[PDB]
Amino acid sequence: FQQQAAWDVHLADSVARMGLAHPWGVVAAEFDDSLLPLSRLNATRLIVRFPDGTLIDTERADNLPPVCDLSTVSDRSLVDIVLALPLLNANGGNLDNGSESERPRRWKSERVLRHNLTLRMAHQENAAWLTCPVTRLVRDAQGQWCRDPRFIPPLLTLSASPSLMTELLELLHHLQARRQRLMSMRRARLADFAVADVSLFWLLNALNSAEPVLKELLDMPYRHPELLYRELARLAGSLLTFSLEHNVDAVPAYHHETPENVFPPLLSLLNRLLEASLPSRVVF
Amino acid sequence: FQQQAAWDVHLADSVARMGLAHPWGVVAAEFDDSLLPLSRLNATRLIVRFPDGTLIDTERADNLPPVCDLSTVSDRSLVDIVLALPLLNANGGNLDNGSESERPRRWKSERAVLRHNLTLRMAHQENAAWLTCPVTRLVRDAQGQWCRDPRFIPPLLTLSASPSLMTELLELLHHLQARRQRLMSMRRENNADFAVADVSLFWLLNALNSAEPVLKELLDMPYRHPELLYRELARLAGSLLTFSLEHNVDAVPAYHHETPENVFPPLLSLLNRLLEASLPSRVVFIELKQKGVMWEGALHDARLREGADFWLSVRSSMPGHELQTKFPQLCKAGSPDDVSEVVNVALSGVIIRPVTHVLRLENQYFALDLSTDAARAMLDAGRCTFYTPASLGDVKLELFAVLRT
Amino acid sequence: FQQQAAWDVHLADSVARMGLAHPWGVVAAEFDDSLLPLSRLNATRLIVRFPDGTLIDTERADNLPPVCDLSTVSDRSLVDIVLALPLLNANGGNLDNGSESERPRRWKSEAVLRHNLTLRMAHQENAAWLTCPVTRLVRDAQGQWCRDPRFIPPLLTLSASPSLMTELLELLHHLQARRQRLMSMRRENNARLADFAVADVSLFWLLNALNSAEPVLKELLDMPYRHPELLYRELARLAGSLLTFSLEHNVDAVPAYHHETPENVFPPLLSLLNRLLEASLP
Amino acid sequence: QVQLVESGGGLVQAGGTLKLSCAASGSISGIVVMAWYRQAPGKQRELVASITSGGTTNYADSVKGRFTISKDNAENTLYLRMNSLKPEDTAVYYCKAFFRRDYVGYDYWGQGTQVTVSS
Amino acid sequence: QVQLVESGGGLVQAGGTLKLSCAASGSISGIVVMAWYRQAPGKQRELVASITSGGTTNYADSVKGRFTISKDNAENTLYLRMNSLKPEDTAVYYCKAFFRRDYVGYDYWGQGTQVTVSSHHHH
Amino acid sequence: QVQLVESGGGLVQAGGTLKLSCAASGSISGIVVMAWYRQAPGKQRELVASITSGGTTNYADSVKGRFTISKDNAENTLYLRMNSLKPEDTAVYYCKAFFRRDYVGYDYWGQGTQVTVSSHHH
């Protein structure tokens, strides 16, 4: 029953960990913004994988967590919402029966087992739960709660963040425009090189190598973003070689839990490096 | 029973989808071609993974689908065969019992244990009630007999599922290895020496040396998903397209998992074309200084030592046809170690011979045929002189060299 | 019961084989070196994945194999220890029921199933088992059995070999230093956002090889618990990029990936890379 | 998700006619096949007729040659024309929808409509 | 792994006081929450009070207003001050430790300590 | 896949001898161990003797000292020389092949050969 599910999840996790460093995060996290003025938060769709390898899916197997009561955080201006799933106890009972425990239990019984999913906040004591960021609520000039548009959770898929998708589609368009212009900027059905060509052919090799690879990663954006990071960082590294004043330390390190400090800075860096292409147009 | 199997297929699929966009396709699809004149198609071996995560293995747990009767497609000239597996119902019953259904059920009962309801269907049929995977294409003869299309390649889970692709890939690796050593040989022997002049020799060698170890390991063990191979193949095509004017960036096919015939064959032939086009400028221009009736050219260039064939570009007030009969006899080259204004004794081993081609319309081109000792004395002294008498008229000389390899 | 377990191993294996050529090897293999003078070997911790897909974890589900008696190899100077797990029989019974068999069975009853893990040696007939190298015992000057320090087992994780790990941290330290010295060289030559030196050309292009690799190798080494096929690919990609400007070593110098014998792949490849790093910029 | 509503049921004499309607709403683009089922008093729910999204019809042996299943794609309505009615056709008729949300199938049902055939 | 040892149990009259102690040793760093449980004769083991590693206390309704759970982090000791004792508080008291190691939870228990509360009318 | 054919079975007087043969064909290179099994009427199939591809023999306690398992690798034939036969040795003898393909084991069997040992009660 519950015994097969236990360590079966460990087998799938151990397989994911052969190709990925952090096989956990959000796939989908959708909310009902309508009850924010009434200080009530509700999830509509949640597909989240916890760091122990547990997959929760409200579209198929799981039931949406109960409403998040924001009455408790009236004194706050920022609240970080997490999805919580109680830890699995190797020694204990993970079934929520009548008896009270000092810790939450993974499952409840229903007319079969149902996961005890709840929405909690990062400022709470959550060590008795497995946790994953799902939104950040910030207040406006009116002082009403509103989901922070800049929020990006630990990602299992690129598609989990539509803002990042936008920022990436934009970066790919910028790269295509700069490649097409620089490819036109090369010169009888043959070519003789110059000092100006040295830099041009460095940039062209960098852009032409990356374009097909980033295009395929973005056509199907349902893979783990460690793949995208590696190829994005590979490009950033290649581009900041002919740029003095820029160290290879500019490329943000991959940190899974905080993608806001890895993908927005890296895409910005890349967009800046793409604009910084100057071909000495006034040299006669 | 059947409830556990479904979720564990979903668990494995969800894990595969972290690293692959399309974790489904063919591993093995073998057929009995012997019954095709009798309008009947039978599968002999099938190892196919469905888009929902379900792996079918005829060698292990699964039973071969019943014979495909081609009597129904007598009016057709092309038929796309797919392996079909009924869609799993979240709400319904996935087992064939007594009661009739409007849709096919995933399982049948045997001995008692579950057996998948695998059947061979065709792409022109309504197949949305099934999970489908292309497994062959049958095309007709001049005689009108059904025969498996040799050009066919199904969606691949492994590279090894397509022996033809395997062959073209081994061929591409051999071509790449040949072109890499040739380019590694034509590298400026300084102490390693790179300068502003040869960006093509560097970036073409950086491209080939970076790719070679990577593509060799992907081909030594060819049992991984082709998405890996495509990424590295496309990365190489991109690197190689920088020095191409006949092929545009749009030439690199996008990854269409469902139709690998429109991705791997075009990409491999593009790469083959780019590899043949990978020949940097093997021409070295030697500047000729004129000091009256003498022409002096410096042979300091390191690449000339390796081995090169020389040619002469000559423009004169003298008519075209009359220049070819006079220039090899009148023009005598000067000794590299010696310095003068007239050469009384021509060098041993130098023979100017007129040629058709090695652009200038009025110029006459001649091959500068040199011996073992003649080319030695010229390169050792690092100079080459040429004597053109007053009888040749307003004569202009330009020296060109074509580096061997 | 045991029917689901066979299918759960096959699923694991079939998925892993889509992105890895060899999804098997050692994660952890620790021993008790004490009482090697008495010719007895004992494992303390074993996390090993078999070529069929079975994961053995002595910390979680599995029990340590019985002691390895070295009295049988008194005539030997080298002994290759492998962790053995009987094959699964598709047709047969994989459980010990007390009825004799011509081959070992995967499980014993303890009621629940327990894997029949055993320590065997490479010089024995082991085709009835799934095998994984776990150590190599060599004799010292006194003629005492001692674990070969040069030993690397087939790796599932980089972290399974602490020696190779520190050898890689050292490669990254070297690469980052040769990169920083190359950053100073471009700066050393007078710059007004323009380059007039050909000497700088080879240098600017060598900086492209190092700056492309550094972020990629840094992330592979920050979390070193992935399959080394990933690390090899990126290490070999770098060796290839540096071999462009060299003639001491040919392109054939980059070792091929031999999963079963990592000693012939990671030490030569790291050696080659460090040689190429010292040679391009002295 | 798909929502289904039956109408058109009633009492008829043997040899009579009825036309049942089934209004479909929701993610209709995912419908693979639509069907009509019927549940008699002591008997279990049996398939009557089906129509694939491509228009391929199929009928139970008992209704074949008398009933007609049809689809109005414009109005997203499934119909069942029941001619030459027999008292044995008395049952509660349900319309069903077999839906696909890749790569899984889902069954959607209507509430039921009573059909009584007197002699 | 964590090792727990209870002391301080005994016989007291109704309205009396006892302080139970629970000495913790082992991988104390993974302790998420510590608790006190009690098992009366014939009845099942019930939760009495809990304290999270951050110091958040919680009490069963029967002991709320009378008992105090506290932690001495320096001495790695959990305490239970039982004031206003009632004969219904007679049971075997166990201290528990809820430990977390790499995304899995584990329960550790003490041996138990007997607490007997006698009647107010000299019995 | 491997195909096995037993021959040499028959009726023997107690104290007699028989030599059973087992012709092996197919993917013979995948055979890990070959064995002889026997099934008496009503009783379950018991292991008699085994031989690994490397030649390591093993015998049931009942047949040890009387029977000999041997392999002719040239002729791909497994043999069982059964000396000092006893009526208790009466059974249907099957040769088995334990085969290996891709990290999975498979069992292949012969059809069976009847061996009857008659008695001199005395």
Side-chain angles (χ1 to χ4, degrees), chain F residues 94-118:
Chain F
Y94 304 91
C95 74
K96 197 197 183 171
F98 176 56
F99 171 90
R100 177 184 174 142
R101 193 169 79 217
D102 264 61
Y103 316 110
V104 183
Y106 306 89
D107 289 343
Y108 294 94
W109 296 91
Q111 74 282 346
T113 186
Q114 182 76 55
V115 170
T116 303
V117 198
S118 48

Short mmCIF file of all heavy atoms in Angstrom, two decimals, chain F residues 94-118:
data_model
loop_
_atom_site.label_atom_id
_atom_site.label_comp_id
_atom_site.label_asym_id
_atom_site.label_seq_id
_atom_site.Cartn_x
_atom_site.Cartn_y
_atom_site.Cartn_z
N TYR F 94 15.82 -34.62 -17.15
CA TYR F 94 15.80 -33.44 -18.01
C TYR F 94 17.16 -32.75 -17.96
O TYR F 94 17.71 -32.59 -16.88
CB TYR F 94 14.74 -32.43 -17.52
CG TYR F 94 13.33 -32.95 -17.42
CD1 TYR F 94 12.85 -33.50 -16.23
CD2 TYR F 94 12.43 -32.81 -18.47
CE1 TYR F 94 11.54 -33.98 -16.12
CE2 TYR F 94 11.13 -33.31 -18.39
CZ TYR F 94 10.68 -33.88 -17.21
OH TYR F 94 9.38 -34.33 -17.13
N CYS F 95 17.69 -32.33 -19.11
CA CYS F 95 18.89 -31.51 -19.08
C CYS F 95 18.41 -30.06 -19.15
O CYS F 95 17.37 -29.76 -19.76
CB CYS F 95 19.92 -31.84 -20.16
SG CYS F 95 19.47 -31.32 -21.82
N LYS F 96 19.11 -29.19 -18.43
CA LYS F 96 18.78 -27.78 -18.32
C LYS F 96 19.96 -26.96 -18.75
O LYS F 96 21.10 -27.41 -18.66
CB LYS F 96 18.44 -27.46 -16.85
CG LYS F 96 17.69 -26.16 -16.64
CD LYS F 96 17.78 -25.76 -15.20
CE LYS F 96 17.01 -24.52 -14.87
NZ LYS F 96 16.96 -24.29 -13.41
N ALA F 97 19.69 -25.76 -19.24
CA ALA F 97 20.70 -24.78 -19.60
C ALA F 97 20.32 -23.44 -18.98
O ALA F 97 19.20 -22.97 -19.16
CB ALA F 97 20.81 -24.65 -21.11
N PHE F 98 21.23 -22.87 -18.17
CA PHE F 98 21.06 -21.55 -17.60
C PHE F 98 21.84 -20.60 -18.50
O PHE F 98 23.07 -20.65 -18.53
CB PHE F 98 21.49 -21.45 -16.14
CG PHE F 98 21.38 -20.05 -15.61
CD1 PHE F 98 20.17 -19.36 -15.67
CD2 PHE F 98 22.48 -19.40 -15.07
CE1 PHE F 98 20.07 -18.05 -15.18
CE2 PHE F 98 22.38 -18.10 -14.58
CZ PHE F 98 21.18 -17.43 -14.65
N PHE F 99 21.10 -19.82 -19.28
CA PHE F 99 21.58 -18.90 -20.30
C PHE F 99 21.55 -17.42 -19.81
O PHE F 99 20.77 -17.08 -18.92
CB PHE F 99 20.74 -19.17 -21.57
CG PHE F 99 20.90 -18.20 -22.71
CD1 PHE F 99 21.87 -18.40 -23.68
CD2 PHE F 99 20.04 -17.12 -22.84
CE1 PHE F 99 22.03 -17.48 -24.73
CE2 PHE F 99 20.20 -16.20 -23.89
CZ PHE F 99 21.20 -16.39 -24.82
N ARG F 100 22.41 -16.56 -20.37
CA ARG F 100 22.49 -15.14 -20.00
C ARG F 100 22.48 -14.25 -21.25
O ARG F 100 23.27 -14.48 -22.17
CB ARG F 100 23.76 -14.90 -19.16
CG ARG F 100 24.01 -13.45 -18.78
CD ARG F 100 25.30 -13.21 -18.04
NE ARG F 100 25.50 -11.77 -17.84
CZ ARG F 100 26.02 -11.22 -16.75
NH1 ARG F 100 26.43 -11.98 -15.74
NH2 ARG F 100 26.14 -9.90 -16.66
N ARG F 101 21.60 -13.22 -21.28
CA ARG F 101 21.49 -12.24 -22.36
C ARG F 101 21.19 -10.92 -21.69
O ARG F 101 20.17 -10.82 -21.00
CB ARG F 101 20.32 -12.62 -23.32
CG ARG F 101 20.26 -11.89 -24.67
CD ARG F 101 19.24 -12.57 -25.59
NE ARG F 101 17.86 -12.20 -25.26
CZ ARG F 101 16.81 -13.02 -25.30
NH1 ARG F 101 16.96 -14.29 -25.68
NH2 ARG F 101 15.60 -12.58 -24.98
N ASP F 102 22.03 -9.88 -21.89
CA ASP F 102 21.77 -8.53 -21.38
C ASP F 102 21.47 -8.44 -19.89
O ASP F 102 20.49 -7.78 -19.53
CB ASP F 102 20.57 -7.90 -22.12
CG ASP F 102 20.87 -6.99 -23.28
OD1 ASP F 102 21.49 -7.47 -24.27
OD2 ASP F 102 20.37 -5.83 -23.27
N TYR F 103 22.30 -9.06 -19.02
CA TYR F 103 22.11 -8.93 -17.57
C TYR F 103 20.87 -9.65 -17.02
O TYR F 103 20.50 -9.44 -15.86
CB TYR F 103 22.11 -7.45 -17.13
CG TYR F 103 23.19 -6.63 -17.79
CD1 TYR F 103 22.89 -5.66 -18.73
CD2 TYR F 103 24.54 -6.86 -17.49
CE1 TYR F 103 23.89 -4.95 -19.39
CE2 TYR F 103 25.55 -6.16 -18.14
CZ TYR F 103 25.22 -5.18 -19.07
OH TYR F 103 26.22 -4.45 -19.65
N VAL F 104 20.22 -10.50 -17.83
CA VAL F 104 19.06 -11.28 -17.40
C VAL F 104 19.37 -12.75 -17.66
O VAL F 104 19.96 -13.06 -18.71
CB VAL F 104 17.73 -10.83 -18.09
CG1 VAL F 104 16.51 -11.60 -17.58
CG2 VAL F 104 17.50 -9.35 -17.90
N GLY F 105 18.99 -13.62 -16.73
CA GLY F 105 19.11 -15.07 -16.87
C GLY F 105 17.84 -15.69 -17.41
O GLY F 105 16.74 -15.18 -17.16
N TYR F 106 17.98 -16.79 -18.19
CA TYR F 106 16.89 -17.56 -18.82
C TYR F 106 17.19 -19.04 -18.70
O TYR F 106 18.34 -19.45 -18.87
CB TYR F 106 16.70 -17.20 -20.31
CG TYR F 106 16.51 -15.72 -20.56
CD1 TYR F 106 17.60 -14.89 -20.79
CD2 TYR F 106 15.24 -15.16 -20.59
CE1 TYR F 106 17.44 -13.53 -21.02
CE2 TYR F 106 15.06 -13.79 -20.79
CZ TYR F 106 16.17 -12.97 -20.99
OH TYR F 106 16.01 -11.62 -21.19
N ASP F 107 16.15 -19.85 -18.42
CA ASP F 107 16.24 -21.30 -18.28
C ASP F 107 15.71 -21.98 -19.51
O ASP F 107 14.62 -21.64 -19.98
CB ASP F 107 15.44 -21.79 -17.07
CG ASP F 107 16.00 -21.44 -15.70
OD1 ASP F 107 17.19 -21.09 -15.61
OD2 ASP F 107 15.26 -21.61 -14.70
N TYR F 108 16.47 -22.92 -20.04
CA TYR F 108 16.07 -23.72 -21.20
C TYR F 108 16.09 -25.18 -20.82
O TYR F 108 16.96 -25.62 -20.08
CB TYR F 108 16.93 -23.42 -22.43
CG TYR F 108 16.74 -22.01 -22.94
CD1 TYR F 108 17.58 -20.98 -22.53
CD2 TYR F 108 15.70 -21.69 -23.81
CE1 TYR F 108 17.38 -19.67 -22.95
CE2 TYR F 108 15.51 -20.39 -24.26
CZ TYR F 108 16.35 -19.38 -23.82
OH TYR F 108 16.15 -18.09 -24.23
N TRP F 109 15.07 -25.91 -21.26
CA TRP F 109 14.93 -27.32 -20.91
C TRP F 109 14.82 -28.25 -22.10
O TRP F 109 14.44 -27.85 -23.22
CB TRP F 109 13.69 -27.53 -20.03
CG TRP F 109 13.73 -26.84 -18.70
CD1 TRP F 109 13.29 -25.59 -18.40
CD2 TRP F 109 14.12 -27.44 -17.47
NE1 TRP F 109 13.40 -25.36 -17.05
CE2 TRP F 109 13.93 -26.47 -16.45
CE3 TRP F 109 14.62 -28.70 -17.11
CZ2 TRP F 109 14.21 -26.73 -15.11
CZ3 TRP F 109 14.93 -28.94 -15.79
CH2 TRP F 109 14.72 -27.96 -14.80
N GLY F 110 15.13 -29.51 -21.82
CA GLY F 110 14.96 -30.60 -22.76
C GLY F 110 13.57 -31.20 -22.56
O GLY F 110 12.87 -30.85 -21.61
N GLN F 111 13.16 -32.10 -23.47
CA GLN F 111 11.83 -32.72 -23.42
C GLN F 111 11.68 -33.74 -22.26
O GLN F 111 10.59 -33.86 -21.70
CB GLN F 111 11.45 -33.34 -24.79
CG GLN F 111 12.16 -34.66 -25.19
CD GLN F 111 13.59 -34.56 -25.71
OE1 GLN F 111 14.10 -33.48 -26.05
NE2 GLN F 111 14.25 -35.71 -25.81
N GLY F 112 12.78 -34.40 -21.90
CA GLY F 112 12.86 -35.42 -20.86
C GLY F 112 13.21 -36.76 -21.47
O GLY F 112 12.89 -37.04 -22.63
N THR F 113 13.88 -37.61 -20.69
CA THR F 113 14.23 -38.97 -21.09
C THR F 113 13.95 -39.91 -19.91
O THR F 113 14.38 -39.64 -18.78
CB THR F 113 15.63 -39.07 -21.74
OG1 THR F 113 15.82 -40.40 -22.22
CG2 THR F 113 16.77 -38.74 -20.79
N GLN F 114 13.15 -40.97 -20.14
CA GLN F 114 12.79 -41.89 -19.07
C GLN F 114 13.92 -42.83 -18.74
O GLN F 114 14.54 -43.42 -19.63
CB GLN F 114 11.49 -42.65 -19.40
CG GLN F 114 10.99 -43.62 -18.31
CD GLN F 114 10.34 -42.94 -17.13
OE1 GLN F 114 9.39 -42.17 -17.28
NE2 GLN F 114 10.80 -43.27 -15.93
N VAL F 115 14.20 -42.96 -17.45
CA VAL F 115 15.17 -43.90 -16.90
C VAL F 115 14.43 -44.76 -15.88
O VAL F 115 13.86 -44.22 -14.93
CB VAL F 115 16.42 -43.21 -16.32
CG1 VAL F 115 17.28 -44.21 -15.54
CG2 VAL F 115 17.21 -42.52 -17.42
N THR F 116 14.39 -46.09 -16.11
CA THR F 116 13.74 -47.05 -15.22
C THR F 116 14.77 -48.03 -14.69
O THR F 116 15.46 -48.69 -15.46
CB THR F 116 12.55 -47.77 -15.89
OG1 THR F 116 11.58 -46.83 -16.36
CG2 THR F 116 11.88 -48.76 -14.96
N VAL F 117 14.86 -48.13 -13.37
CA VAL F 117 15.77 -49.08 -12.74
C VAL F 117 14.93 -50.15 -12.04
O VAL F 117 14.17 -49.84 -11.12
CB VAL F 117 16.83 -48.43 -11.83
CG1 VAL F 117 17.99 -49.38 -11.57
CG2 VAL F 117 17.34 -47.12 -12.42
N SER F 118 15.04 -51.39 -12.51
CA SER F 118 14.31 -52.53 -11.96
C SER F 118 15.06 -53.14 -10.80
O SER F 118 16.27 -52.96 -10.68
CB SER F 118 13.95 -53.55 -13.03
OG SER F 118 15.05 -53.89 -13.86
#
